Design an enzyme around this catalytic site. Sequence first.
Site, PDB file in Angstrom:
ATOM      1  N   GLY A   1     -33.297 -66.570   3.028  1.00 52.83           N
ATOM      2  CA  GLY A   1     -33.598 -66.767   4.119  1.00 52.83           C
ATOM      3  C   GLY A   1     -34.241 -64.712   4.474  1.00 52.83           C
TER       4      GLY A   1
ATOM      5  N   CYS B   1     -37.604 -64.977   3.974  1.00 57.81           N
ATOM      6  CA  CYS B   1     -38.592 -65.888   4.616  1.00 57.81           C
ATOM      7  C   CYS B   1     -39.346 -65.118   6.213  1.00 57.81           C
ATOM      8  CB  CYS B   1     -38.952 -67.144   4.178  1.00 57.81           C
ATOM      9  SG  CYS B   1     -38.854 -67.873   1.933  1.00 57.81           S
TER      10      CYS B   1
ATOM     11  N   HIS C   1     -43.113 -73.206   5.886  1.00 59.41           N
ATOM     12  CA  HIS C   1     -42.176 -74.348   5.089  1.00 59.41           C
ATOM     13  C   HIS C   1     -41.323 -74.055   5.561  1.00 59.41           C
ATOM     14  CE1 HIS C   1     -40.165 -70.884   3.345  1.00 59.41           C
ATOM     15  NE2 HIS C   1     -40.959 -70.456   3.277  1.00 59.41           N
TER      16      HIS C   1
HETATM   17  C1  LIG Z   1     -37.479 -68.105   2.133  1.00 56.73           C
HETATM   18  O1  LIG Z   1     -36.708 -67.539   2.685  1.00 56.73           O
HETATM   19  C2  LIG Z   1     -36.932 -68.957   0.639  1.00 56.73           C
HETATM   20  C3  LIG Z   1     -37.037 -67.149  -0.716  1.00 56.73           C
HETATM   21  C4  LIG Z   1     -37.518 -67.057  -2.238  1.00 56.73           C
HETATM   22  C5  LIG Z   1     -34.888 -67.917  -2.292  1.00 56.73           C
HETATM   23  C6  LIG Z   1     -35.215 -67.678  -3.391  1.00 56.73           C
HETATM   24  C7  LIG Z   1     -34.774 -66.216  -3.580  1.00 56.73           C
HETATM   25  N1  LIG Z   1     -35.988 -65.141  -3.255  1.00 56.73           N
HETATM   26  C8  LIG Z   1     -36.686 -65.926  -2.756  1.00 56.73           C
HETATM   27  O2  LIG Z   1     -37.847 -64.958  -1.877  1.00 56.73           O
HETATM   28  N2  LIG Z   1     -38.472 -69.192   0.317  1.00 56.73           N
HETATM   29  C9  LIG Z   1     -38.127 -70.595  -1.152  1.00 56.73           C
HETATM   30  O3  LIG Z   1     -37.040 -70.959  -0.989  1.00 56.73           O
HETATM   31  C10 LIG Z   1     -39.300 -71.726  -1.524  1.00 56.73           C
HETATM   32  N3  LIG Z   1     -39.099 -71.631  -3.222  1.00 56.73           N
HETATM   33  C11 LIG Z   1     -39.059 -70.107  -3.694  1.00 56.73           C
HETATM   34  O4  LIG Z   1     -39.146 -69.524  -3.458  1.00 56.73           O
HETATM   35  C12 LIG Z   1     -38.783 -70.741  -4.842  1.00 56.73           C
HETATM   36  C13 LIG Z   1     -37.878 -70.232  -6.143  1.00 56.73           C
HETATM   37  C14 LIG Z   1     -38.569 -71.027  -7.492  1.00 56.73           C
HETATM   38  C15 LIG Z   1     -38.806 -72.236  -7.575  1.00 56.73           C
HETATM   39  C16 LIG Z   1     -38.906 -72.912  -9.096  1.00 56.73           C
HETATM   40  C17 LIG Z   1     -38.824 -71.889  -9.715  1.00 56.73           C
HETATM   41  C18 LIG Z   1     -38.514 -71.045  -9.912  1.00 56.73           C
HETATM   42  C19 LIG Z   1     -38.177 -69.567  -8.373  1.00 56.73           C
HETATM   43  C20 LIG Z   1     -39.210 -72.411  -0.870  1.00 56.73           C
HETATM   44  C21 LIG Z   1     -38.992 -72.691   1.261  1.00 56.73           C
HETATM   45  C22 LIG Z   1     -40.879 -73.385  -0.874  1.00 56.73           C
HETATM   46  C23 LIG Z   1     -42.061 -72.286  -1.170  1.00 56.73           C
END
Ligand SMILES: *C(=O)[C@H](C[C@@H]1CCCNC1=O)NC(=O)[C@@H](NC(=O)/C=C/c1ccccc1)[C@@H](C)CC
Lengths: 303, 303
Positions: free
Chosen positions: B143, B145, B41
Site C-alpha cells: 500500500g 507505493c 503498475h
Molecule cells: C506497492 O504498494 C508495493 C510496495 C511493496 C509491497 C511489498 C512490501 N514492501 C513494498 O515496498 N509494490 C509491489 O507490490 C510491487 N512488487 C514488489 O514489491 C515485489 C516484492 C517482491 C517480489 C518478488 C520477490 C521478492 C519481493 C508490485 C507492484 C510489482 C512492481
Amino acid sequence: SGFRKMAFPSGKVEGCMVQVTCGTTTLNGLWLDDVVYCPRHVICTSEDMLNPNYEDLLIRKSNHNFLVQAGNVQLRVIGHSMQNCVLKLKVDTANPKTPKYKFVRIQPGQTFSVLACYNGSPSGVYQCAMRPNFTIKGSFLNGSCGSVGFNIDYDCVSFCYMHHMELPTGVHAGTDLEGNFYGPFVDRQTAQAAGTDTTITVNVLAWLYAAVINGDRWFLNRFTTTLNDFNLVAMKYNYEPLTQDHVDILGPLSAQTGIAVLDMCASLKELLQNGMNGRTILGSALLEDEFTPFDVVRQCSGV
Amino acid sequence: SGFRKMAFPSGKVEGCMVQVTCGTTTLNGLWLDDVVYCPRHVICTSEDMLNPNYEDLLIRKSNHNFLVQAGNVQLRVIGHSMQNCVLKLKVDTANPKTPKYKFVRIQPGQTFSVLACYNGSPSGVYQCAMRPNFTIKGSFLNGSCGSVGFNIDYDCVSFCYMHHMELPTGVHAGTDLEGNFYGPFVDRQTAQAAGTDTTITVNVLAWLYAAVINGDRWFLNRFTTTLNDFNLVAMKYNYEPLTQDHVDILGPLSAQTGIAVLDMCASLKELLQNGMNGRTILGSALLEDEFTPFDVVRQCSGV
Ligand SMILES: *C(=O)[C@H](C[C@@H]1CCCNC1=O)NC(=O)[C@@H](NC(=O)/C=C/c1ccccc1)[C@@H](C)CC
Ligand SMILES: *C(=O)[C@H](C[C@@H]1CCCNC1=O)NC(=O)[C@@H](NC(=O)/C=C/c1ccccc1)[C@@H](C)CC
C-alpha cells in the site's frame, strides 16, 4: 519490510509555530487557539540567568514587551501569565490552523517526534525517547528553545515536550506543555547534570521482535529463561527491570512472531553476555532501546 | 549540540498526497497543480504482473477507470497518460495546496526525506540515502507505493523519488518523478536483485566531522595520509574512492574543526583497520554513511 526511526508527519505542528521576542532574545512559541506558549526564560537577561526570580521579572513586563510574529504577520499580545516554567501570551487572533490537540505528559521510555525550529520556522523532524533520567538525546542549537515534541493519534496532536536547555553532557532538558520540567532540572544557571541513565529493556525486546519480523533471526535460540533470572542479568548490565506488565505489553509481538517473551529474554541475556561478535541487528551494532512496542507494531504492520 | 537522522518538515508534501484506485488496487498519488502522479503498475492485475505490456494495458483503460480521492473529496480524472513508469492523471481541479516544487533526480550518496503514506494518508517521515547500487533502505509495507521522497530548499520542494517496489533483500526501489527508475530495476515480476553495494566514503568523513563538532574526539590522531594511500585502504574495505572534489566539498567542515581532510582520512583508515574496540561515535558502533556534508553543516550550524 524495513525498520527506520520514523517521526510523525509534522504538518499539523508546523502550522502552530510562531516567533517570540522579548528584549534581545528570540525563540519559538506554540500558537494554539488564542494563546502562544513559550519558555518563560525568554524574559531573562544574562544579567539575570544566575538566580532569576521569574515572578519579579514578569511583574516588570508588559504586553507590549512581547513581539509575536506568525510568518510575516504580527500578533498583538493582549494578556500574559506564567504557568510554571512556560509563559502564556494571549493574542488577539485565534490560530486558524489549530489542530485537535491535547497536553499530555509522557513517561520515561516513551517516544515522541520533535519539530526543531528556529525563529518560528521549522528546520527538521526526528524521533526522541524520554530517557529514564528524564533527559532526551536531541539535536538543538541556540534559538531552538520553544520547539515542541509530540505524538499524533488519528488526527489529534498530543503535545508532550517543550525545549528549554542543554546539559553539559550534550543531552537536552525541557518541560511538558503545562511548564513542568521533566526531571530535576531548572531554568536557571547551575552546574546541573544528568543523573545516571539506564537502558529501556522493554524497548530493546520490542526492537528484537521488529528484527525478527524483518528477517533478522541470528540471535534467536532454544533457551528460555525465568523472569527473575533475566532481571538478575539485566541489573548487572544497567538495564531496567522487566515487569509482568512489560511482558503483557509485548504479547501481540510475541504472538505475531511465535516467539515467547521469555524466549526473547534468553536471546537478550546471551547478547548482553557475549555481544554480537561482529554481526548487526536491523543495521545496528548496538542494542537499540528507543523504539516502544507501539512504535514497532505501528511500523511493522504486515512486516 | 546533538546529531540526529533528521527529516525535512513534511507539511508541504502532506498537502499533496491523494489516494488512487484502479480495479482492486489502491495506492498513493502526488497531486500537483491539476495532475496526479502515481506508479503505472496501479493498472496491472496479478494476472499481468509477469510480462505486462504497459502500453497494451493503458490503451484498454479509460478516465473513469481511475478513482482519485483527496481526503473525502473525489477528483474527476479528465485525462491520463504514461510517462515512463509513472502515470499522469489530469484532474478537474488544481491542488490549492501546491507548493513551489521541482522534479530533480538525485545521485547515489545523496539523502532525502521519505513521507510514508497509505491510502493517501501520511504515516511517518524519515531520512534515506540513495545507495551506490541505486536502492534505498526504507520502511515500506504493501500500500505504500506512490509515497514520495524529497528535499526542501528554502520553501521549494524538490521531489526526487516515488516508491514502486521491494527487493528480495528487503531494500526498496523506485523512480524519479519523471518515471525513470533508479538502478537496473523494472516494474514487472522478475528475480531482480540488488547489485553489490559500497560504503559512501565522503559521507563517513562528514559524519566524523559531525562527531568532532559534537565533542567526540577519541578517534583523532597525529597521522596524516596521502589521498592515494587512503584510497588503497578504502578499496580493500568496500569503500568508494575519495576524489579531490570530495576533499574540496569537505573544506568548510575541515575549516570549522581545524582538522585537515587528509588527517581525518588517517583516522578513518585506523578505524577501518582496527575497529572501535568497544567505543562509539555519536551513539553508533558502526561507521555511518547516510549523512552528506550538507546534512552535517545544516544540522551542526554553531554546534
Ligand atoms: C506497492 O504498494 C508495493 C510496495 C511493496 C509491497 C511489498 C512490501 N514492501 C513494498 O515496498 N509494490 C509491489 O507490490 C510491487 N512488487 C514488489 O514489491 C515485489 C516484492 C517482491 C517480489 C518478488 C520477490 C521478492 C519481493 C508490485 C507492484 C510489482 C512492481
Ligand atoms: C534556547 O534556545 C537555548 C537552547 C540551548 C542553547 C545551547 C545549545 N543547545 C540548546 O538546547 N536554551 C538556553 O540557552 C538555556 N541554557 C542552556 O541551554 C545551558 C547550556 C549550558 C550551560 C552551562 C553548562 C553547560 C551547558 C538558557 C535559556 C538558560 C535556561
